Amino acid sequence: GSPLFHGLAPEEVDLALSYFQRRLYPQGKPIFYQGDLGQALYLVASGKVRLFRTHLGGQERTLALLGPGELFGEMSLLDEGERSASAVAVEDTELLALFREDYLALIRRLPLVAHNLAALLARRLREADLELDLLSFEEARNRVAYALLKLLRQGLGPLFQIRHHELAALAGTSRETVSRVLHALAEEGVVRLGPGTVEVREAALLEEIAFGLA
Amino acid sequence: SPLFHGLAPEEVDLALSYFQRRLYPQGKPIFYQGDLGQALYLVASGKVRLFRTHLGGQERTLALLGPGELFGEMSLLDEGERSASAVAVEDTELLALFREDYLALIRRLPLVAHNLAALLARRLREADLELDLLSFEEARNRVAYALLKLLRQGLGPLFQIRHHELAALAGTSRETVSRVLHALAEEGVVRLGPGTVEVREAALLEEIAFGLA
Ligand SMILES: Nc1ncnc2c1ncn2[C@@H]1O[C@@H]2COP(=O)(O)O[C@H]2[C@H]1O
Ligand SMILES: Nc1ncnc2c1ncn2[C@@H]1O[C@@H]2COP(=O)(O)O[C@H]2[C@H]1O
Ligand SMILES: [Mg+2]
Numbered sequence: 001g002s003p004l005f006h007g008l009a010p011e012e013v014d015l016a017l018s019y020f021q022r023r024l025y026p027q028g029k030p031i032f033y034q035g036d037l038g039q040a041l042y043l044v045a046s047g048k049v050r051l052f053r054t055h056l057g058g059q060e061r062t063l064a065l066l067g068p069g070e071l072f073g074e075m076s077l078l079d080e081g082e083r084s085a086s087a088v089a090v091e092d093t094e095l096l097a098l099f100r101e102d103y104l105a106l107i108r109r110l111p112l113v114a115h116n117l118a119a120l121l122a123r124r125l126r127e128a129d130l131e132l133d134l135l136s137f138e139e140a141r142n143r144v145a146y147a148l149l150k151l152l153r154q155g156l157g158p159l160f161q162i163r164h165h166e167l168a169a170l171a172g173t174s175r176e177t178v179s180r181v182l183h184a185l186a187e188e189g190v191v192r193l194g195p196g197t198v199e200v201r202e203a204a205l206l207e208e209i210a211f212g213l214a
Numbered sequence: 215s216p217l218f219h220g221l222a223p224e225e226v227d228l229a230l231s232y233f234q235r236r237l238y239p240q241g242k243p244i245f246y247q248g249d250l251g252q253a254l255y256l257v258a259s260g261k262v263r264l265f266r267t268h269l270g271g272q273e274r275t276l277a278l279l280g281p282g283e284l285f286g287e288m289s290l291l292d293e294g295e296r297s298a299s300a301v302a303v304e305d306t307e308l309l310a311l312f313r314e315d316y317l318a319l320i321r322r323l324p325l326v327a328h329n330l331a332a333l334l335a336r337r338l339r340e341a342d343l344e345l346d347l348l349s350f351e352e353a354r355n356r357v358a359y360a361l362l363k364l365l366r367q368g369l370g371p372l373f374q375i376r377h378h379e380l381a382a383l384a385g386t387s388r389e390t391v392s393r394v395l396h397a398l399a400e401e402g403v404v405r406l407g408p409g410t411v412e413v414r415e416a417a418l419l420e421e422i423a424f425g426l427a
């Protein structure tokens with residue numbers, strides 16, 4: 001069941017599908033490219049589609065693998081801007097295409113289709129905010145160790161009155177990952193934790209961990 | 215207001231009747247990040263600052279919005295949290311559209327829902343452009359970190375090293391490394407030659423390696 005059709009009665013789904021046109025793309029055929037003039041969105045009826053952007057001397061960053069029921073190409077449909085990504089068939093693929101003029105007449109009968117596009121884009125923007133904030137545990141570990149190292153280097157230590165959040169601000173990670181890292185560092189016997197305190201036990205081992213050789 | 219793009223003048227009037235006026239004197243919070251929002255807003259008068267909390271308790275400012283501009287559409291659409299905080303920076307008048315009234319409105323003026331999808335489409339374009347940049351930014355930290363490790367393993371400050379060697383060390387591609395190295399060189403952090411990378415500014419390099427500079 002396509003999210004584009006969420007909320008619609010069975011008859012209304014049938015109604016909506018009647019505005020679409022069938023388009024076929026064999027394995028490995030480009031559907032469209034980033035920067036192309038676009039006048040339609042696509043539902044995947046069968047097969048598999050890959051979306052990707054190109055940058056950095058022609059390198060590709062994959063954004064999505066889409067199977068049956070999934071939607072793409074709605075941005076050029078909506079704003080008449082160029083395609084924001086390339087789309088290639090990775091299997092023999094059947095696409096149901098909805099052109100801009102047919103879309104305009106459809107939402108006049110079923111506004112919930114326009115709203116469903118809005119919601120999908122909202123879902124995607126949320127996934128994008130997450131990708132901004134994301135970092136591997138391993139690198140988080142180095143960065144948190146380095147932050148602790150920085151406190152060691154003020155010449156007092158090795159016991160610190162410090163909240164996980166102040167350490168997170170120091171390291172540039174979230175409070176949650178700082179706690180995750182500190183619990184792993186305590187399990188390794190590198191630090192000892194208490195109510196509002198972090199005590200470094202193994203400073204040399206910590207310094208090793210900060211610089212990623214441990 | 216672009217939310218009403220394409221509407222006849224009497225349709226704009228009809229659309230505006232679904233909104234509700236809310237007043238916010240200067241410095242008053244309109245909503246916080248994490249709130250379960252039930253409405254989107256238009257600025258009728260005044261000025262709103264949108265800002266997001268980015269790890270540690272700090273706030274990146276997203277925009278300053280004046281008359282005619284729209285915000286708070288996310289929670290309206292998906293019923294999830296506000297992804298930013300909004301505060302009045304002047305005495306402000308807002309037109310608010312609650313979810314049940316939004317649903318009734320687009321049933322009557324479908325172009326409004328279209329105009330909203332179109333706007334989110336513009337923001338997603340901007341976001342992809344930013345995410346292209348994130349790949350490179352993360353690469354720049356990881357490349358710095360790789361060189362930093364060579365420096366701390368005793369080597370340097372001049373390294374005999376090929377780009378592909380660095381790429382293996384940093385978990386990136388050769389092309390990206392070449393680009394990262396060119397930027398660090400313009401930043402004065404390293405100096406390059408045939409098969410060589412020289413660290414000029416070890417402390418700066420260290421900061422870059424941990425995502426601090
Ligand atoms: N960040 C993203 N995540 C998932 N899909 C996207 C993203 N950005 C663009 N797309 C899709 O890729 C399509 C490429 O062409 P369009 O811009 O017409 O519409 C685009 C969206 O359907
Ligand atoms: N990156 C961004 N750029 C511009 N505006 C944004 C950005 N992120 C969030 N917003 C706006 O800030 C609002 C805060 O509440 P919502 O998430 O409901 O809807 C959000 C958008 O209107
Ligand atoms: Mg009402």
